[PDB]
Amino acid sequence: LDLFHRAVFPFMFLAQCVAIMPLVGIRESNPRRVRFAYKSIPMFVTLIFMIATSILFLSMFTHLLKIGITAKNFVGLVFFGCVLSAYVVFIRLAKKWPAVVRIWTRTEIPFTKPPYEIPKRNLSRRVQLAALAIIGLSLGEHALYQVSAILSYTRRIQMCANITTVPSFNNYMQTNYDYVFQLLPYSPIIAVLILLINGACTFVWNYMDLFIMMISKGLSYRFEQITTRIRKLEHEEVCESVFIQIREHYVKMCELLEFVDSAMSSLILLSCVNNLYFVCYQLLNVFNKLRWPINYIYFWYSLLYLIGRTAFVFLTAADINEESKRGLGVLRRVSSRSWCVEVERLIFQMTTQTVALSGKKFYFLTRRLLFGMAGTIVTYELVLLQFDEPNR
Amino acid sequence: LDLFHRAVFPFMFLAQCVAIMPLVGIRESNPRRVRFAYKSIPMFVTLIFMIATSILFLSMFTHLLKIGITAKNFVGLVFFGCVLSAYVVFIRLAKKWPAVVRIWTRTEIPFTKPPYEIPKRNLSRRVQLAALAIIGLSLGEHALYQVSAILSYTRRIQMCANITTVPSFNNYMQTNYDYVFQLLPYSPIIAVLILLINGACTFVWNYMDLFIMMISKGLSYRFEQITTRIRKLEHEEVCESVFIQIREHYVKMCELLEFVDSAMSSLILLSCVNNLYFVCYQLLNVFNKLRWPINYIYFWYSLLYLIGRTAFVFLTAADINEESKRGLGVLRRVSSRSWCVEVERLIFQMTTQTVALSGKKFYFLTRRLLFGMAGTIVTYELVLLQFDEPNR
Amino acid sequence: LDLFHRAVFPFMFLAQCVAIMPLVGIRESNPRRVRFAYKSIPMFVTLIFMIATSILFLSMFTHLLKIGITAKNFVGLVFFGCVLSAYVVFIRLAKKWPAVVRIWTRTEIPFTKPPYEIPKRNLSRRVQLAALAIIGLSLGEHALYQVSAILSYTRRIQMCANITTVPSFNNYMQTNYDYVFQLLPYSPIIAVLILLINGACTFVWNYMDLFIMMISKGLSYRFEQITTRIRKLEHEEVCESVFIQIREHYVKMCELLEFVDSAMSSLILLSCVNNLYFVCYQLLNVFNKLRWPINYIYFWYSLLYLIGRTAFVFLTAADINEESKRGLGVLRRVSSRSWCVEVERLIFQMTTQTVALSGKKFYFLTRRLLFGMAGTIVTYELVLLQFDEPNR
Amino acid sequence: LDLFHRAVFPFMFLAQCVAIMPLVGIRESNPRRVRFAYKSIPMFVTLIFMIATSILFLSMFTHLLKIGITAKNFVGLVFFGCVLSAYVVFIRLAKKWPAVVRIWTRTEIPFTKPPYEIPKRNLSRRVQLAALAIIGLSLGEHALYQVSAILSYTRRIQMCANITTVPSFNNYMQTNYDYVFQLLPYSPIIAVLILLINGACTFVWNYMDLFIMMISKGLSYRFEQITTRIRKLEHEEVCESVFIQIREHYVKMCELLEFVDSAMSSLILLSCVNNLYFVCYQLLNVFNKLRWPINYIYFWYSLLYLIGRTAFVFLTAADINEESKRGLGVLRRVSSRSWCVEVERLIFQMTTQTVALSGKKFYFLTRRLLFGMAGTIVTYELVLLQFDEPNR
Ligand SMILES: OC[C@H]1O[C@](CO)(O[C@H]2O[C@H](CO)[C@@H](O)[C@H](O)[C@H]2O)[C@@H](O)[C@@H]1O
Ligand SMILES: OC[C@H]1O[C@](CO)(O[C@H]2O[C@H](CO)[C@@H](O)[C@H](O)[C@H]2O)[C@@H](O)[C@@H]1O
Ligand SMILES: OC[C@H]1O[C@](CO)(O[C@H]2O[C@H](CO)[C@@H](O)[C@H](O)[C@H]2O)[C@@H](O)[C@@H]1O
Ligand SMILES: OC[C@H]1O[C@](CO)(O[C@H]2O[C@H](CO)[C@@H](O)[C@H](O)[C@H]2O)[C@@H](O)[C@@H]1O
C-alpha cells in the first residue's frame, strides 16, 4: 500500500542492518508492531555498533590530541561525533517512532482515499528513486574514496616509500586507515570489522540527509495531494464542505509536520550543522590542488554530491512550504460566489504559518532559507579563503 | 495595437538576427503563428550560432586552462558560458513562448479596453525607448571596447612592440582577439565571422537584461493600468462589481506573472547571478589604475552602464511590486460605505502575496531586494578589496 | 498657532539666511503665500550662495586631484558635494513645498481641534527645543573645530614652523583653510566670505538632519495626538463614528507621510547616506590618536554629536512607526462590544502598512532599521579597521 | 502562595544582601509593602556598596589608563561599568518595582484560579531550581576563578618569583588583585572588604541574567498556563465566553509583558550587550592556550556557563514567544462550529504581535533572534580571529 512506512522500511531495514535507529519489528508491513524494546536483537546490534563507533571516535580523539587538533584534522572529530550523535538522536527518534509512525499513518489514511490520487510516482517509487540515488552516490563517494586511497597509495608505493612493500589489504589498513592501531591491536579480523564499521559510519553520515529527505518526501507527497485536489476544483463552484475538509486535512498535515519537527529537531539540527560544516569545508577546499586526477574526480564528485545533497534535502524540506504556498495561488483564484470564511482562514494560514520543517524553530527550511544559507556560505567562504590564504 | 508582442517583435526579430531564443514566425503581428518548429531557418541559424559560440567557449576554455584560470581570467568563462546558458534557457523559454505569449495576449486583451487607458507612453513606445537606450549603451560599451582596444594597441605599437607592424584588422585579430587561433586557423573570413559572433555574444549578454526589462515593463504597464483605474475611482463611491473586476484582473496579472516566472526562472537566475558577478567584478576593479584615459572612460562607462542596467532592470522588475503596492494606498482610502469584502481580499492579497518577479522563489525582485543586493555587494566588496589588496 | 509651518519658519528663515531651500515669503505666518518664484531676492541669494559653494567644491576637487583622492581626502568631496546636493534636492523640495505645506496644513487643521489636545510641549516648543539643541551642538561642533584649528596651529607656531609668523586671521586662512587659494586670489574680503560660506555649508550639513528631524517631529506630533486620543477611550465603550474618524485621521496622516516621503526621498537618502559615511568615518577614526587634548575633545564631541544626531533623527523618524504601533496595543484592548469592522481595518493597517519614513522605499525608518543600521555599521567597522589596520 | 513575588523574594533578599536593586520591605510576603524610600537601611547599604563599586571602577579606570586600555584590558572596564550600570538601572527598576509588582500580582491573581492549574513545578520551585542552578554555577565560576588564581600563583611562587614569599591572603591581595592599591592603602580590612565587593560585583554580573531569567520564567509560567488551558479544550466544543476570557487573559499578559519591557528595557539592553561582549570575548579566547589545566577547566567552565546562561536566559525569554505561539496551533485545531470572531482576533494577535521581551524594541527576544545572534556571533568571530590572529 502507498504508505510512508511501506516506503521507508526497505531502507529502514537496510539502516538497521548497519544498526541505525534501532527498532524491533521494522520489517513488518504494519506500523503498530514496530517498538523500542530492549529485549531482542536490534538494540544489541546497535549497541555493539555504537561501542564500535565509540572506540573509533575515542581512538581518533586521542590520536588527534597526540597529533594536534586543527581545522583540517577536526573533520574526523565532526564525522565520528556526528555519527555517534546521529546514533543518539536516532535512539531518541525511535523512542517516539512508534508514536511518530502511528500519527503519520493515522493522518495519511485519508490521503489514500478517492478524493485524492497518485499522479505518476507513488510514495513508494518517489521515495525509492531518490533514496536509491542517494545510496548510489553514497556508494560512489565511498567507492572513489577507496579508489583514490588505494591507487594514490600504491602508485605512491611504486615511487619511493620502500617500493618492496607489496600493496595489500593489511598494508592499506596500517597506512591509509590510521587512528585505529594506536588503541586497537593490528589484525585482519579487526581490520575487516573496521571496514564494516567505517562503511556503516559513512552510511550514518549519508543516511542522516537521506532520512531527512525521506521525511520531506513523505510530507511533500501528501501536500502535493492537497494541492492537486485544490487545483482539480479550480474553475468549478466549490462547496463549503469540500473547503472545510481540505482545511482539516491541511491542519492535520501541519499537525504531522509539527510532531515530526518535535521528534526530529535533534536530527534536523544535526544534519543542518553537519552539512554546513562539510559543505563549508569542501568549498574551503575548492581553490586548492590535489595529488592525482583520481583524487581530483573523487573530491569534485564529493563536492557535487555534498552540495547537491544538501540542496536537494533542503529543497525537499522546502517543498513542503512551496507546496503549501502553491495551493495559495489557486485559492486566490476563487470567485466571490464561494468564499464561505473557511477559504479566508486557509489563505491566512498558508500565508502566515510558514508551514515547513525547522531545526528547533531557529530557522524554517524554506527556499528563502536555502538562499540565505547560500549567501551565508558565500560570506563564510569570503572570510575563510582569507583565513587559510597563506596555507594554500 | 498596444500589445506586448507587437512591442517586443521589433526587438525579438533583431535578437533572432543574431539568433537569440529561436522561434518560427517572430515577424508576424499575431502571437499565435509563432512556434518552436525544427523545420525552418531559425533553429538552423541558432544552431550554427550556438556551435560558433561553443567553439569560442571551448577554445577559450582550453586557452585559459593552458594559461591558468584565475579570478581575472574567469571573466571570459562566465561571459561565454553565460551566453551559451542564455542560448539554452532561451531555447527552453521558446519551448513555452508559444504558450507564454498566448497567455500574455489572452490576459492583456482586457487591458486594451475602455475601462483602461494609455496615459502618455504606450507599451510600444515605453518598451521602445528603454530597449533602444539599452541597445544604444550596449553599442556604446562595445564601441569604446573596440575603441580602447585598437587605440591602446596601436598607440602601443608606436612605442616598442616592433613598431614596423602596421596597425591592421588582421593584426588586431591576432593580438587583441586571442583564445581563437590556438584552435581555429587564422583567416580574414574566420576573423570577420569572429567579430560577428563576438558582437552577437555581447548582444546575448546585454539582451539578457534587456529582455528581462522588456518583460518587467510589459507587466508593469498593465499593473500601472490597474493602479490608474484604482486612482480614477478615488473619491467616488465604487460599486462591488468594479472592485470584483479589478480583483479579477489583478489575479489574472498575478497568474501571468507566475507563469512568466516559471518560464523565466532560468533566465532570471542567470541574469541575476551574471549581473552579480559582473558588477562585483567591476566594483572589484573600481579602486585601480588603467593604462590610458580612453581605457578609463571605457571602463567607467562600462561601470555606469552595468550598475545602472542592473539597477534599472531590477527596478523595473520591482516596479511590478511597487505598482501593486501603490494601489494598496488608494484602496486604504476607501470609506466604510463600499467595503464589500472584495476590497478586503484585494488588500490582503497585495499586502501578503509580495507580487514580484523571482529567481526560483529564492528571492523576489523588489526594492527591498534591491537594497539588500546593494548591501550584499557592499559587504562582498569590503571582503574582496581585502582579497585582492596585494595585487593592486 | 500650533502649526508645523509656524514651528519651522523661525528655522526656515534662519536657513534661508544662509540660503537653504529657497522660497519667497517664508517669513509669513500663512502657508499659502510661500512660493517658488524666480523674481525676488531668495533664489538670487541661494544662487550666489550656490555658486560660492560650487567654487568651493570645484577648487577642492582640483586641489585633491592635484594631491590625490584618498579615503581620508574624500571627506571634503562628500561634504561639499553633499552640501550642493542638499541645495539641489532642497530646490526640488521647494518646488513642491507650496504643495507640501498646503497638504500638511490641510491635514493638520483637524489636529488642532477639541477631540485632540496639546499634552505638555506644543509643536512650537517641541520643534524649538530640539532644533535649538541641534543648532547649539552644531555651533559647538564648528566652535571647537575652529578652536582646535587655531590653537593647534598657533601652539604649533610656537614650536618650529617659523615662529616669527604671528598667529593672525589671514595666516589661519592661508594655512588651515586650503583648497581655496589655488583657484581664488588671497584677500581678506574673499577670506571673510569664505568663512561665511563655510559656516553656511556646515549649516547645510547639519540642517539636513535638523530638517529631517523637524519633519519627523511634525509627523510624530500628530501621531502622538492620535495615540493619545486612542488611549483616552481606553476603558470606555467607543462608538463606531469615533473609530471611523480616528481611522480617517490615521489614513490622512499616512497620506501626509507618503506625500512628504515622495517630496523628501532625495533628502532622506542624501542624509542617510551622508550620516552613514560620516559616522562610519568617525568610528573608523575611533581607535587612533590625535595631536592635542583640544583636538581630542573636539573629535569626540563631533563623534557623540554625529552618532547621537543620526540616532536621534532616525529615532524621531522611527517615532512615527512606534507611535502608530503604540495605538495598536490600545486597540487590542477593545472588548467584543465595539469591534465594528473599522477597528479590524485599523489594526490590520498599523500591523501591515509599516507606517514610517523611507529613503526611496529601499528601507523604512524604524527602530528595527536603526538596529539593522547599528549592526551594519558594526560589521563595516569590523572590516574597516582591517582595511586601515597598517595605517594606524 | 504561587506568586512571582513569593518566588523572587528568597532571591531578591539575597540580592539586597549584596545590595542589588534596593527596596524597603523586600522580605515581606505582600507585594504592596515593598517601596522605594530613602529613609531606611537598604538605600544606605546600596549607596555604600555603590561607592565601593565606584572606587573599584575608578581605581581600575586610572590603573588601566596608566597601563593602557586594550581589548584585553577593556574586560575590567565593561565588568565594573556594567555592575555600576546594573546598579543604576536596578535603582530605576525599583522606582517602578512597587508599580511593577503591583501590576504583576494584579494580573497574576486570575492565574491562581480553578480555570488554571499547576502542572508539575510551581512558579516557586520552577524559579528556585533555575535560580539555585545559576547561583551554583556562579559560585562555581568564581570558585574556580579563585582556584585558578591562587594555585597558578603559588605553583608559580614555587618556581622563581622569589620562592621565599609564603603564599598568603595578603600576598594574593597584593599580586592577583591589582587596580586597588594604587588608590586605596594596603590593609587586611580593606582586603576583606575588597573580596566582599568583588563577590558582590560578580553577583551583580550574574544576577543580571539571573533576574532576567526570573522575569522570563514568571511570564512563561502564566503563558504556559494559558496554553495548557487552550490544550485542555482541544477536542471539545468551546463556548464564546471561554474564548473571550482566554483572549482577555492573553491581552493582560501582553500588558504585563509590555509594562515589564518598559521598566526593564535598560536592564535587558544592558544584559544583552554585556552577554554579547563576554561571549564574544570568551569565543575570541577559544582558540588559544592557557597556563595550567586548572586554568583550562576554569576558563572552559566559564565558557559553557556564559554561553549556556546567555542561551538559557534568552531561551526563557523566547519561551514567552514560543508559548504564545504554541497555543496558536491548538487554536488552528478549532472546528467551524465555534469560531465566534474572538478566536480570529486571538489568532491574528499571536500571529502578528510577536509577543516577546525586547531590548528597546530594537530586537524581540525570540528563538529566531537567538539564531540570528548565533549567526552574528559566528560572523563576529570570523572577523575577530582575523583581528587577533598575530597575537595568538
Ligand atoms: O577521516 C575519518 C574516516 O572517515 C573518512 C573521512 O571522515 O571517510 C568518511 O568520509 C568519506 C567521504 O564522504 C565517506 O564516504 C566515508 O564512508 C566516511 O567514512 C575517512 O577519511 C576516514 O576513514
Ligand atoms: O573576454 C572574452 C571576449 O568578451 C569580452 C569580455 O568578456 O567582451 C565582452 O564584454 C564587452 C564589454 O561589456 C562587450 O561589450 C563585448 O561585446 C563582449 O563580447 C572581450 O574581452 C572578449 O572579446
Ligand atoms: O574639509 C573641508 C572643509 O569642511 C570641513 C570638513 O569637511 O568642515 C566641515 O566639518 C566640520 C565638522 O563637522 C563642520 O563643523 C564645518 O562647519 C564643516 O565645514 C573643514 O575641514 C573644511 O573647512
Ligand atoms: O577584572 C576585574 C575583576 O573582575 C574579574 C574579571 O572582570 O572577575 C569577574 O569575573 C569573574 C568570572 O566571571 C567573576 O566570577 C568574578 O566574580 C567577577 O568579579 C576579575 O578578574 C577582577 O577581580
List Cβ<8 Å contacts ≥24 apart for C164-170: none
B141 a known binding residue?
yes
| Beta-carbon count within 10 A of B32 CB | 12
| Pocket-testing residue among A135, A181, A202, ligand 1, by greatest number of atoms within 8 A of Cβ | A202
CA separation for the pair A84, A59 (Å, rounded)? 14
CA separation for the pair A191, D93 (Å, rounded)? 67
Question: Beta partners for D24?
Answer: D35
Amino acid letter, D74:
F
CB-based contacts of A163, cutoff 8 Å, min separation 6: A157
Amino acid letter, A13:
F
Spatial contact of A153 and A167, defined as CB atoms under 8 Å apart: yes
What is chain A's Cα-based Rg? 24
Task: Give me the phi and psi of D24, to 5 degrees please.
Answer: -100, 125
Q: What share of chain D is helix, strand, coil (3-state, %, to 5)?
A: 70, 0, 25
Instruction: Find, among A261, A128, B328, B171, the residue nearest to D367 by Cα.
Output: A261
Task: Give me the phi and psi of C24, to 5 degrees please.
Answer: -100, 125
- Chain A CB contacts of B341 under 8 Å are 336, 339
Residues in A 45-74 with any Cβ partner in D closer than 8 A? none
Task: Kindly report the three-state secondary structure assignment for every residue of chain A.
Answer: CCCHHHHHHHHHHHHHHCCCCCCECCCCCCCCCCECCCCCCHHHHHHHHHHHHHHHHHHHHHHHHHHCCCCCCHHHHHHHHHHHHHHHHHHHHHHHHHHHHHHHHHHHCHHHCCCCCCCCCCHHHHHHHHHHHHHHHHHHHHHHHHHHHHHHHHHHHCCCCCCCCCCCHHHHHHHHCCCCCCCCCCCHHHHHHHHHHHHHHHHHHHHHHHHHHHHHHHHHHHHHHHHHHHHHCCCCCCCHHHHHHHHHHHHHHHHHHHHHHHHHHHHHHHHHHHHHHHHHHHHHCCCCCCCCHHHHHHHHHHHHHHHHHHHHHHHHHHHHHHHHHHHHHHHHCCCCCCCCCHHHHHHHHHHHCCCCCECCCCCECCHHHHHHHHHHHHHHHHHHHHHCCCCC
Resolution reading in Å: 2.6
Where b means 16+ CB within 10 Å and e means fewer, D301-336 reads bbbebbbebbbbbbbbbbbbbbbbbbbbbbbbbbee
Where b means 16+ CB within 10 Å and e means fewer, A237-256 reads ebeeebbbebbbbbbbbbeb
**Scanning the structure block, which residue is given the C-alpha cell 471611523?**
C244
Question: Beta partners for B24?
Answer: B35
Residue having the nearest C-alpha atom to atom 5 of ligand 3: C76
Is residue B392 one of the residues assigned to a domain?
no
Tally C-beta pairs within 8 A across A and B.
Answer: 47
Task: Give me the phi and psi of C19, to 5 degrees please.
Answer: 60, 65
**Residue B215, CA distances (Å) to B7, B10, B126, B253, B339 in order:** 10, 14, 12, 13, 33
Is residue C57 one of the residues assigned to a domain?
yes
Secondary structure of residue B127 in the 3-state scheme: helix
Interface test with B, best of A336, A352, A353, A371 (most B CBs within 10 A): A336
Query: Which residue from A347, A351, A370 is facing B362, i.e. has the nearest CB?
Result: A370
CA separation for the pair D388, D392 (Å, rounded)? 7
**Residue D167, CA distances (Å) to A167, D154, D187, D190, D192 in order:** 63, 6, 17, 19, 17
Spatial contact of A60 and A80, defined as CB atoms under 8 Å apart: yes
Q: How many Cα neighbours within 13 Å face the side chain of A246? A: 32
CA separation for the pair D77, D184 (Å, rounded)? 18
CB-based contacts of D323, cutoff 8 Å, min separation 6: D220, D223, D224, D226, D227
Which chains touch D (3+ CB pairs under 8 A)? A, C
B76 a known binding residue?
yes
What is chain B's Cα-based Rg? 24
Q: Tell me whether D273 touches chain C (CB under 8 Å).
A: no
Instruction: Find, among A233, A222, A253, the residue nearest to A330 by Cα.
Output: A233
Spatial contact of A123 and A218, defined as CB atoms under 8 Å apart: yes
Spatial contact of A25 and A35, defined as CB atoms under 8 Å apart: yes
CA separation for the pair A96, A99 (Å, rounded)? 5
Interface test with B, best of C361, C377, C380 (most B CBs within 10 A): C361
> From its phi and psi, is residue B25 left (phi > 0), alpha (psi between -120 and 50) or beta?
left
Spatial contact of B321 and B354, defined as CB atoms under 8 Å apart: yes
- Chain D CB contacts of C352 under 8 Å are 352
Question: Beta partners for A358?
Answer: A364
Experimental method: cryo-EM
Q: Tell me whether D119 touches chain A (CB under 8 Å).
A: no
Q: Which atom of ligand 1 is nearest to the CA of A278?
A: 13
Residue having the nearest C-alpha atom to atom 4 of ligand 3: C76
Spatial contact of C312 and C172, defined as CB atoms under 8 Å apart: no
Largest interatomic CA distance in chain B: 87
| Beta-carbon count within 10 A of C8 CB | 25
Is residue D91 one of the residues assigned to a domain?
yes
Secondary structure of residue B383 in the 3-state scheme: helix
**Residue C80, CA distances (Å) to A93, C59, C274, C278, D329 in order:** 65, 11, 11, 13, 57
CA separation for the pair A61, A74 (Å, rounded)? 9
Distance from CA of B352 to the nearest CA of A (A): 7
Secondary structure of residue D358 in the 3-state scheme: strand
CA C357 to chain centre: 13
| Pocket-testing residue among C145, C194, C310, ligand 3, by greatest number of atoms within 8 A of Cβ | C145
CA of D168 to the centre of ligand 4 (A): 20
What are the cell numbers at A94?
A: 525511535
What are the cell numbers at A264?
A: 526530529
C-beta atoms of C329 and D254 within 8 A: yes
Amino acid letter, A249:
H
- Calculate the dihedral angle through the C-alpha atoms of A47, A49, A53, A58, rounding to the nearest 10 degrees: 50
CB-based contacts of B99, cutoff 8 Å, min separation 6: none
Spatial contact of C356 and C220, defined as CB atoms under 8 Å apart: no
**Residue C60, CA distances (Å) to A53, C64, C86, C90 in order:** 71, 6, 18, 23
Residue B208 parent element (H or E): helix B188-232
Question: Beta partners for A35?
Answer: A24
Spatial contact of C202 and C138, defined as CB atoms under 8 Å apart: yes
Secondary structure of residue B205 in the 3-state scheme: helix
CA separation for the pair A355, A258 (Å, rounded)? 9
Instruction: Find, among A320, A308, A325, the residue nearest to A365 by Cα.
Output: A320
Is residue B71 one of the residues assigned to a domain?
yes
Q: Is D281 in the pocket of ligand 4 (CB under 6 A)?
A: no
Instruction: Find, among D180, D190, D229, the residue nearest to D56 by Cα.
Output: D180
Which protein residues are within 6 Å of ligand 1, measured from CB? A 75-76, 79, 141-142, 145, 198, 201-202, 302
Residue having the nearest C-alpha atom to atom 9 of ligand 1: A202
Distance from CA of A389 to the nearest CA of B (A): 9
Q: Which atom of ligand 3 is nearest to the CA of C75?
A: 7
CB-based contacts of A194, cutoff 8 Å, min separation 6: A56, A173, A177, A180
CB-based contacts of D45, cutoff 8 Å, min separation 6: D16, D19, D22
- Chain A CB contacts of B387 under 8 Å are 382, 385-386
Residue D78 parent element (H or E): helix D74-108
Q: How many Cα neighbours within 13 Å face the side chain of B19? A: 21
CA separation for the pair A312, A218 (Å, rounded)? 14
DSSP characters for D99-167?
HHHHHHHHHHSGGGSTTS---SS-HHHHHHHHHHHHHHHHHHHHHHHHHHHHHHHHHHHTSSS-TTS--
B142 a known binding residue?
yes
What is chain D's Cα-based Rg? 24
Residue having the nearest C-alpha atom to atom 1 of ligand 3: C76
**Scanning the structure block, which residue is given the C-alpha cell 496558536?**
D328
CA separation for the pair D238, D337 (Å, rounded)? 9
Q: Which atom of ligand 3 is nearest to the CA of C141?
A: 15
**Scanning the structure block, which residue is given the C-alpha cell 559560585?**
D139
DSSP annotation of B265 reads H
Secondary structure of residue D364 in the 3-state scheme: strand
What are the cell numbers at B213?
A: 526589462
Instruction: Find, among B81, B85, B56, the residue nearest to B184 by Cα.
Output: B56
Q: Tell me whether A336 touches chain B (CB under 8 Å).
A: yes
Spatial contact of A344 and A392, defined as CB atoms under 8 Å apart: no
Distance from CA of B15 to the nearest CA of A (A): 32
Spatial contact of D290 and D389, defined as CB atoms under 8 Å apart: no
DSSP annotation of D35 reads B
CA separation for the pair A244, B231 (Å, rounded)? 37
**Scanning the structure block, which residue is given the C-alpha cell 585582492?**
B388
| Beta-carbon count within 10 A of A46 CB | 22
Residue B251 parent element (H or E): helix B240-284
Q: Is C76 in the pocket of ligand 3 (CB under 6 A)?
A: yes
- Calculate the dihedral angle through the C-alpha atoms of B13, B14, B18, B24, rounding to the nearest 10 degrees: 0
Where b means 16+ CB within 10 Å and e means fewer, C359-386 reads bebbbbbbbbbbbebeebbebbbbbbbb
Range of the domain at C20: 4-387
**Scanning the structure block, which residue is given the C-alpha cell 546575448?**
B204
**Scanning the structure block, which residue is given the C-alpha cell 560544516?**
A277
C-beta atoms of D362 and C339 within 8 A: no
Structurally, chain C folds into a number of domains equal to: 1
- Chain B CB contacts of A343 under 8 Å are none
What are the cell numbers at C255?
A: 497620506
Task: Kindly report the three-state secondary structure assignment for every residue of chain C.
Answer: CCCHHHHHHHHHHHHHHCCCCCCECCCCCCCCCCECCCCCCHHHHHHHHHHHHHHHHHHHHHHHHHHCCCCCCHHHHHHHHHHHHHHHHHHHHHHHHHHHHHHHHHHHCHHHCCCCCCCCCCHHHHHHHHHHHHHHHHHHHHHHHHHHHHHHHHHHHCCCCCCCCCCCHHHHHHHHCCCCCCCCCCCHHHHHHHHHHHHHHHHHHHHHHHHHHHHHHHHHHHHHHHHHHHHHCCCCCCCHHHHHHHHHHHHHHHHHHHHHHHHHHHHHHHHHHHHHHHHHHHHHCCCCCCCCHHHHHHHHHHHHHHHHHHHHHHHHHHHHHHHHHHHHHHHHCCCCCCCCCHHHHHHHHHHHCCCCCECCCCCECCHHHHHHHHHHHHHHHHHHHHHCCCCC
DSSP characters for D280-335?
HHHHHTSSS--SSHHHHHHHHHHHHHHHHHHHHHHHHHHHHHHHHHHHHHHHHT--
Task: Give me the phi and psi of B35, to 5 degrees please.
Answer: -135, 170
CA separation for the pair B387, B154 (Å, rounded)? 34
CA separation for the pair A214, A7 (Å, rounded)? 9
CB-based contacts of D282, cutoff 8 Å, min separation 6: D299, D302, D303, D306, D307
Is residue D392 one of the residues assigned to a domain?
no
Task: Please give the annotated binding residues of A for D-maltose, written as ranges.
Answer: 141-142, 179, 198, 202, 298
Query: Which residue from C348, C349, C380 is facing B382, i.e. has the nearest CB?
Result: C380
Secondary structure of residue B35 in the 3-state scheme: strand
Q: Which atom of ligand 2 is nearest to the CA of B60?
A: 2
Let me know how long chain C is. Answer: 392
- Chain B CB contacts of A332 under 8 Å are 251, 254, 349, 353
Question: Beta partners for A368?
Answer: none
Question: Beta partners for C358?
Answer: C364
> From its phi and psi, is residue D89 left (phi > 0), alpha (psi between -120 and 50) or beta?
alpha
Task: Give me the phi and psi of D237, to 5 degrees please.
Answer: -75, 115
Alpha-helical (H) ranges within B158-187 are: 169-176
Q: How many Cα neighbours within 13 Å face the side chain of C67? A: 14
Handedness of CA C167, C171, C172, C178 (dihedral sign): negative
Q: Is C75 in the pocket of ligand 3 (CB under 6 A)?
A: yes
Spatial contact of C41 and C13, defined as CB atoms under 8 Å apart: no
Angle subtended by helix axes D240-284 and D293-332, to nearest 10: 160
- Chain C CB contacts of B322 under 8 Å are 361
Let me know how long chain B is. Answer: 392
What are the cell numbers at B109?
A: 486583451
Question: Beta partners for D364?
Answer: D358
CA separation for the pair B358, B320 (Å, rounded)? 11
